[PDB]
């Protein structure tokens, strides 16, 4: 990972909401596709998410279905449970993409950015070459140079 400077986190929905802007950026989901593909891992959630966006992108132009008065509200309820499902589908995938990649860097030995956790290789947050005295969250004064978690040889 060539990006190592400090970062800023945004909640899943606040990124999922951007849709084809960054979340469903065509080439991005092609990236995490191949990465999933090559690892022998089935790309089920991505293709599960891919159809979600592809339909939303295709139909982002139209009006919402005419809100005729329904005292039952089943249509408004179905309009919500089907939505929160879609969010929950992307919620899993959004986390899933961050799950493998940090673990993937455990296999390529690429030091992720600051305040980043790889499940086994960097159990707590790794921070090297920051702009501050200490580990930003654990208040541990950094070691110089940036501490290394992998073994030196390739």
């Amino acid at each position: 990972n060539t990006y190592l400077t400090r970062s800023v986190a945004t909640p899943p929905i606040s990124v999922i909401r951007t849709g084809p802007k960054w979340w469903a950026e065509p080439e991005r989901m092609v990236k995490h596709k191949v990465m999933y593909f090559t690892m022998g891992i089935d790309q089920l959630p991505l293709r599960r998410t891919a159809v979600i966006q592809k339909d939303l992108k295709r139909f982002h132009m139209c009006k919402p279905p005419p809100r005729v008065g329904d005292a039952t509200g089943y249509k408004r309820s179905r309009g919500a449970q089907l939505t929160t499902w879609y969010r929950r589908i992307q919620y899993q995938e959004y986390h899933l993409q961050h799950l493998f990649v940090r673990h993937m860097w455990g296999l390529l030995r690429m030091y992720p950015g600051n305040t980043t956790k790889i499940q086994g290789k960097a159990d707590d947050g790794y921070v090297g070459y920051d702009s501050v005295h200490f580990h930003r969250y654990n208040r541990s004064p950094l070691p110089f140079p940036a501490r290394e978690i992998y073994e030196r040889r390739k």
């Binding site: 295709r58 139909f59 132009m61 139209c62």
Partner: protein, 44 residues
Amino acid sequence: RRGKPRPRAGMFPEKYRRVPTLLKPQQGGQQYFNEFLIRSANDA
């Protein structure tokens, strides 16, 4: 600055009022209608 609250969505003009009515929604795949009417005429 506004300094007043944000207006609702309906009072704002239509978000895509410029795209032609033909495109929302895009009736894609007109190619297939002639294929589907045939197979449907087949079974019927």
